[PDB]
Design an enzyme around this catalytic site. Structure first.
Site, mmCIF file in Angstrom:
data_model
loop_
_atom_site.group_PDB
_atom_site.id
_atom_site.type_symbol
_atom_site.label_atom_id
_atom_site.label_comp_id
_atom_site.label_asym_id
_atom_site.label_seq_id
_atom_site.Cartn_x
_atom_site.Cartn_y
_atom_site.Cartn_z
ATOM 1 N N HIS A 61 25.905 7.046 36.534
ATOM 2 C CA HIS A 61 26.204 7.973 35.572
ATOM 3 C C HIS A 61 28.013 7.797 35.616
ATOM 4 O O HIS A 61 28.493 8.290 34.439
ATOM 5 C CB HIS A 61 26.185 9.326 36.049
ATOM 6 C CG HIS A 61 24.866 9.541 36.333
ATOM 7 N ND1 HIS A 61 23.611 9.793 35.537
ATOM 8 C CD2 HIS A 61 24.134 9.684 37.767
ATOM 9 C CE1 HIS A 61 22.567 9.903 36.310
ATOM 10 N NE2 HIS A 61 22.837 10.082 37.641
ATOM 11 N N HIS A 91 36.604 9.939 39.691
ATOM 12 C CA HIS A 91 35.947 9.107 38.885
ATOM 13 C C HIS A 91 36.326 9.456 37.545
ATOM 14 O O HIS A 91 37.112 10.418 37.348
ATOM 15 C CB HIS A 91 34.188 9.641 39.074
ATOM 16 C CG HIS A 91 34.066 11.005 38.792
ATOM 17 N ND1 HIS A 91 34.155 12.006 39.595
ATOM 18 C CD2 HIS A 91 33.878 11.582 37.514
ATOM 19 C CE1 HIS A 91 33.839 13.072 39.232
ATOM 20 N NE2 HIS A 91 33.787 12.935 37.887
ATOM 21 N N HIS A 93 35.004 9.860 33.267
ATOM 22 C CA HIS A 93 34.177 10.112 32.167
ATOM 23 C C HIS A 93 35.163 9.444 30.837
ATOM 24 O O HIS A 93 36.118 9.592 30.566
ATOM 25 C CB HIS A 93 33.806 11.390 31.682
ATOM 26 C CG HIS A 93 33.482 12.361 32.852
ATOM 27 N ND1 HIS A 93 31.982 12.260 33.063
ATOM 28 C CD2 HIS A 93 34.009 12.893 33.767
ATOM 29 C CE1 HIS A 93 31.991 12.911 34.252
ATOM 30 N NE2 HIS A 93 32.955 13.390 34.780
ATOM 31 N N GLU A 103 35.779 15.201 28.396
ATOM 32 C CA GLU A 103 35.093 16.492 28.759
ATOM 33 C C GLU A 103 35.737 17.721 28.583
ATOM 34 O O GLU A 103 35.270 18.532 27.246
ATOM 35 C CB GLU A 103 34.537 16.755 30.452
ATOM 36 C CG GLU A 103 33.754 15.192 30.571
ATOM 37 C CD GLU A 103 32.730 15.578 31.784
ATOM 38 O OE1 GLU A 103 33.232 15.906 33.000
ATOM 39 O OE2 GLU A 103 31.566 15.395 31.480
ATOM 40 N N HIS A 116 38.737 12.636 37.051
ATOM 41 C CA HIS A 116 38.371 13.878 37.797
ATOM 42 C C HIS A 116 38.669 13.377 39.281
ATOM 43 O O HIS A 116 38.212 12.577 39.939
ATOM 44 C CB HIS A 116 37.005 14.153 37.787
ATOM 45 C CG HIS A 116 36.829 14.665 36.366
ATOM 46 N ND1 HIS A 116 35.435 15.192 35.848
ATOM 47 C CD2 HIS A 116 37.783 15.480 35.383
ATOM 48 C CE1 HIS A 116 35.658 15.626 34.697
ATOM 49 N NE2 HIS A 116 36.811 15.964 34.469
ATOM 50 N N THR A 195 30.341 19.126 36.301
ATOM 51 C CA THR A 195 29.797 18.820 34.817
ATOM 52 C C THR A 195 28.862 17.882 34.821
ATOM 53 O O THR A 195 28.587 17.583 33.676
ATOM 54 C CB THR A 195 31.251 18.068 34.090
ATOM 55 O OG1 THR A 195 31.485 16.880 34.617
ATOM 56 C CG2 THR A 195 32.381 19.054 33.989
#
Ligand SMILES: NS(=O)(=O)c1ccc(-c2ccccc2)cc1
Ligand SMILES: [Zn+2]
EC number: 4.2.1.1
Length: 257
Positions: A61, A91, A93, A103, A116, A195
């Protein structure tokens, strides 16, 4: 199993993880005119000089850069926090297009990606116990916009070829996360959640106001990663972000005027 596709994406998560509809879910939209300056907030304390990175992992992910969190080496303190939070991993997104990927949003604005940095409260002994507590985690969120390259990000970009698919990892020692920070540590803060599933409501969110700039080539290489495992049909790892969730009974506080 949960993911970010049409049939297993954020709109489906509540069926396996009913807390997805809970009272302090993340991310949220940061309405800059409604966030209140809080003069009692202290400056953030980011002590990363002794950080010990170990490994980078494609978990299907995102990719995590993992740190040695068996001692107080890289810690976040101050700001809204009581006590000491140890860095365990960071990591990102990101989107399929530069116009989306973050996010959190700022006055509904979406950034190209969001970093994050995940820390756990040392009074709970380990990360697994911490995520079971309302003040168990502190996540430092940093927006990425596309423009000039971020030199301190390039060592991450260059190892991604070796962890293309789910379950692959690579040695990743001596990486200095200080090279990923913007100049200012002004921030917004609010109580929220992980999240991704299990979406536990255990996070003090600290989102920096100042984004970092990364180059189009750098984020392009993020988008070459795969959600799938090796030998499975290729699905590009893009748009691995959860959209903004209802703020409900929460106030976002600002560290700055
Ligand atoms: N995107 S995030 O809020 O920073 C996040 C960090 C860790 C986790 C996690 C994953 C597996 C087990 C426990 C926590 C989930 C989300
Ligand atoms: Zn995250």
């Amino acid at each position: 199993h949960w993911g970010y596709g049409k049939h297993n994406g954020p709109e489906h998560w509540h069926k396996d993880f009913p807390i997805a509809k809970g009272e302090r879910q993340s991310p949220v939209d940061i309405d800059t005119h409604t966030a209140k300056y809080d003069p009692s907030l202290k400056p953030l304390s980011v002590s990363y000089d002794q950080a010990t990175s170990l490994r980078i992992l494609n978990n299907g992910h995102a990719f995590n850069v993992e740190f040695d969190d068996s001692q107080d080496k890289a810690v976040l303190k101050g700001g809204p926090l009581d006590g000491t939070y140890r860095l365990i991993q960071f990591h990102f997104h990101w989107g399929s297009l530069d116009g989306q990927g973050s996010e959190h949003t700022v006055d509904k604005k979406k950034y190209a990606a969001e970093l994050h940095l995940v820390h756990w409260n040392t009074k709970y002994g380990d990360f697994g116990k911490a995520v079971q507590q309302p003040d168990g985690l502190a996540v430092l969120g940093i927006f990425l916009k596309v423009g000039s390259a971020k030199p301190g990000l390039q060592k991450v970009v260059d190892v991604l070829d070796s962890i293309k698919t789910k379950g692959k990892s690579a040695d990743f020692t001596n990486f200095d996360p200080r090279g990923l920070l913007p100049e200012s540590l002004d921030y917004w803060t609010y109580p929220g959640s992980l999240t991704t599933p299990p979406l536990l409501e255990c996070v003090t969110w600290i989102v920096l106001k100042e984004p970092i700039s990364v180059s189009s080539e750098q984020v392009l290489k993020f988008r070459k990663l795969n959600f799938n495992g090796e030998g499975e049909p290729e699905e590009l790892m893009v748009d691995n972000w959860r959209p903004a969730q209802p703020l409900k009974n929460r106030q976002i506080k600002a560290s700055f005027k």
